[PDB]
Write a protein that holds these residues in place. Structure first.
Motif, PDB file in Angstrom:
ATOM      1  N   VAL A 107      41.307  90.109 100.760  1.00 11.02           N
ATOM      2  CA  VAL A 107      40.985  91.194 101.674  1.00 11.02           C
ATOM      3  C   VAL A 107      41.321  90.932 103.145  1.00 11.02           C
ATOM      4  O   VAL A 107      42.082  91.693 103.751  1.00 11.02           O
ATOM      5  CB  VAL A 107      39.490  91.587 101.560  1.00 11.02           C
ATOM      6  N   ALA A 108      40.752  89.871 103.715  1.00 13.23           N
ATOM      7  CA  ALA A 108      40.993  89.529 105.117  1.00 13.23           C
ATOM      8  C   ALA A 108      42.478  89.338 105.424  1.00 13.23           C
ATOM      9  O   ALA A 108      43.012  89.977 106.320  1.00 13.23           O
ATOM     10  CB  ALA A 108      40.221  88.261 105.490  1.00 13.23           C
ATOM     11  N   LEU A 112      44.747  91.719 107.820  1.00 12.75           N
ATOM     12  CA  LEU A 112      45.255  91.086 109.030  1.00 12.75           C
ATOM     13  C   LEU A 112      46.783  91.137 109.081  1.00 12.75           C
ATOM     14  O   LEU A 112      47.365  91.522 110.100  1.00 12.75           O
ATOM     15  CB  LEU A 112      44.768  89.632 109.105  1.00 12.75           C
ATOM     16  N   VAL A 122      46.575  86.004 116.177  1.00  9.87           N
ATOM     17  CA  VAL A 122      46.201  84.831 115.399  1.00  9.87           C
ATOM     18  C   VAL A 122      47.329  83.807 115.360  1.00  9.87           C
ATOM     19  O   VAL A 122      47.101  82.619 115.559  1.00  9.87           O
ATOM     20  CB  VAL A 122      45.840  85.201 113.937  1.00  9.87           C
ATOM     21  N   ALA A 126      47.664  79.965 117.035  1.00  9.26           N
ATOM     22  CA  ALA A 126      47.930  78.790 116.218  1.00  9.26           C
ATOM     23  C   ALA A 126      49.235  78.076 116.591  1.00  9.26           C
ATOM     24  O   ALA A 126      49.654  77.144 115.906  1.00  9.26           O
ATOM     25  CB  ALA A 126      47.958  79.181 114.737  1.00  9.26           C
ATOM     26  N   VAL A 206      47.363  79.287  99.770  1.00  6.63           N
ATOM     27  CA  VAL A 206      47.165  78.698 101.091  1.00  6.63           C
ATOM     28  C   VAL A 206      48.201  77.631 101.447  1.00  6.63           C
ATOM     29  O   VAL A 206      48.855  77.727 102.489  1.00  6.63           O
ATOM     30  CB  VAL A 206      45.750  78.110 101.215  1.00  6.63           C
ATOM     31  N   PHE A 207      48.337  76.606 100.606  1.00 10.18           N
ATOM     32  CA  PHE A 207      49.333  75.556 100.841  1.00 10.18           C
ATOM     33  C   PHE A 207      50.444  75.856  99.851  1.00 10.18           C
ATOM     34  O   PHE A 207      50.323  75.593  98.658  1.00 10.18           O
ATOM     35  CB  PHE A 207      48.738  74.161 100.600  1.00 10.18           C
ATOM     36  N   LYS A 259      49.534  79.275 105.816  1.00 10.86           N
ATOM     37  CA  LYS A 259      48.327  78.463 105.769  1.00 10.86           C
ATOM     38  C   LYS A 259      47.233  78.959 106.712  1.00 10.86           C
ATOM     39  O   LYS A 259      46.077  79.087 106.309  1.00 10.86           O
ATOM     40  CB  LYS A 259      48.673  77.005 106.090  1.00 10.86           C
ATOM     41  N   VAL A 260      47.597  79.240 107.962  1.00 14.14           N
ATOM     42  CA  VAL A 260      46.625  79.722 108.938  1.00 14.14           C
ATOM     43  C   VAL A 260      46.007  81.052 108.507  1.00 14.14           C
ATOM     44  O   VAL A 260      44.799  81.242 108.611  1.00 14.14           O
ATOM     45  CB  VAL A 260      47.265  79.896 110.334  1.00 14.14           C
ATOM     46  N   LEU A 261      46.836  81.962 108.013  1.00 14.31           N
ATOM     47  CA  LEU A 261      46.359  83.274 107.581  1.00 14.31           C
ATOM     48  C   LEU A 261      45.605  83.230 106.246  1.00 14.31           C
ATOM     49  O   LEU A 261      45.014  84.224 105.820  1.00 14.31           O
ATOM     50  CB  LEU A 261      47.540  84.247 107.484  1.00 14.31           C
ATOM     51  N   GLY A 262      45.632  82.078 105.589  1.00 12.05           N
ATOM     52  CA  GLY A 262      44.947  81.947 104.321  1.00 12.05           C
ATOM     53  C   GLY A 262      45.541  82.791 103.206  1.00 12.05           C
ATOM     54  O   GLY A 262      44.831  83.186 102.282  1.00 12.05           O
TER      55      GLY A 262
END
Lengths: 319, 312
Positions: A107-108, A112, A122, A126, A206-207, A259-262
């Motif tokens: 969702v996030a 975003l 964001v 970073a 993520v990674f 990675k930062v944004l997940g």
């Protein structure tokens, strides 16, 4: 293992979404059912969904949201919807409420990445280079720190409408008025010219693993002496003709941003290359899966066969 | 006008949600129905919803999500849930899909304001002061630019679970282990002390108006003591205004829509925007409504305005 594929939607990318679904249904290595969201917002299930796919467009559905779908029959849901009610986190949220694992950004991250202003804030925070820009909201007197030329556009990532390239401040008000008919918030990005468009796929939670870098080139339509009319084309250069250094930087930048944004399952990260400088332009949480789409073609060149790509995406949803 | 109020939820704030629901339902100037989400996630409609409201808690519901409800009957939905499946943008998204106007922040704002990591990155970039912090995911080596004491807490958890106050740089691994039980991502925030807690309410879409500033002060434990609410907060005119302006700036940048209680920490002259609550409380004791009352906005008028904002 059963998979629920969702395609179509009320957005302008309805047809391309169906085209992707076609490709996914033809090669996904798991038993999969199709559910379609018609352009009128109603859903089509079962044979009706497959029939609409064959038609390349579903103008009308049968079931108003929420669809009478037997969610319990599916292990993972693959939402292949673009833009509004696709990559904006709304459907992702619905699936969270249903408690169903699903492919792609959560969702996030989805919401975003769909906001040109907030995702840049964001990324800039970073250390990821982005095109100088400013956000303007309807009613606010525009405050732009840089001089033209710049691009004015609605804040919804990927939009192809409401965009204007302005060369003078006196033309800013008109560009904003146009952009505001599509989104209450717009962004003003410093224009870089000339620029090259580079895209890279990412796979993983993520990674991730980065695919080789691809480039988009435009060839304009023209009238040939013998062939008469020759259509314009968007050529995909895979791999992109880049020196080792730049290739590694874009791949690293893509992985870092991801990675930062997940971001979770996949993403095609778009960049602008100009004057030897890289700028992350946009992240697409739900790329194309058409045999002509950059994302699958990139990973194919990266040793990841289409069927295998779909397999890993499904498996990642269960983390 | 026909309003559907939704309260309860699966989060630990299930009961306070009902309490605020009781208040809202008794003073909302519009015909309003109540739907309740029980702790097991199943919904209660009509008569059973009211019963649960009066019982102050609903352990289990009747209807699996999504409920067999015709949303045509309502002009505005008021999701009065807190935390998980409340302020995280999930229910908001469901409502977006139903095509229903609703009170409060949209999907993006709700999801961002509930992520202690992403929200801070946005605010820091925007120039809003936030307590120094770092984000850490399960499996990645921690790098803390500061020394204890500091807090460790799950990032997207709108709950008090998994939080630890670290004193020794050697207890970090342990605190992270706990936090990671509630989110694969956690944040480490420098601990401020002495520290004062200030709160200000905002009302409006994107460009809001701030209420007077309030201050939360706890009494001695006797079982933690009463949470005193000083209103207005005892601040010189200069700090009060800064709190309000910062609150309004954050609100704007994040694009919050109907309301928000913005919480701040005040440590040795410095303000730090702590949290942005998109669905605040509405009990007679809740800070948000009391703050706006003091600002000249009666409870009924407050509720009326939130409903109307949902439509614009």
């Amino acid at each position: 293992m059963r998979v629920l594929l969702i395609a179509g939607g009320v957005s302008p990318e309805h047809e391309v979404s169906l085209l992707s679904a076609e490709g996914v249904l033809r090669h996904i290595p798991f038993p999969t059912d199709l559910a379609v969201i018609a352009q009128d917002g109603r859903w089509l299930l079962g044979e009706k969904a497959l029939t609409a796919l064959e038609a390349k467009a579903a103008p009308e559905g049968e079931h108003p949201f929420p669809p009478p779908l037997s969610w319990e029959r599916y292990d993972v849901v693959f939402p292949l919807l673009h833009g509004r009610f696709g990559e904006d986190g709304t459907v992702q949220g619905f699936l969270e409420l249903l408690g169903k694992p699903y492919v792609g950004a959560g969702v996030a991250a989805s919401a975003l990445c769909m906001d040109k202003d907030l995702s840049k804030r964001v990324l800039a925070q970073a250390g990821v280079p982005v095109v100088p820009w400013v956000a303007v909201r309807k009613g606010e007197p525009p405050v732009v720190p840089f001089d033209p030329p710049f691009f004015v556009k609605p804040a919804n990532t990927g939009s192809s409408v409401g965009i204007s390239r302005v060369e003078r401040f006196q033309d800013l008000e008109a560009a904003l008025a146009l952009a505001f008919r599509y989104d209450e918030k717009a962004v003003v990005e410093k224009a870089l010219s000339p620029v090259r468009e580079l895209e890279v796929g990412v796979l993983g939670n993520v990674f991730g693993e980065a695919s080789p870098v691809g480039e988009v080139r435009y060839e304009a339509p023209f009238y040939d002496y013998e062939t008469k009319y020759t259509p314009g084309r968007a050529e995909l250069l895979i791999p992109a003709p880049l020196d080792p250094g730049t290739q590694e930087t874009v791949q690293e930048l893509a992985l870092k941003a991801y990675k930062v944004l997940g971001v979770r399952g996949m993403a095609r990260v778009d960049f602008f290359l100009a004057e030897g400088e890289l700028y992350l332009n946009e992240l697409n949480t739900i790329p194309g899966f058409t045999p002509t789409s950059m994302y699958p073609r990139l990973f194919e060149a990266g040793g990841v066969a289409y069927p295998e790509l779909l397999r890993r995406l499904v498996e990642l949803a269960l983390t």
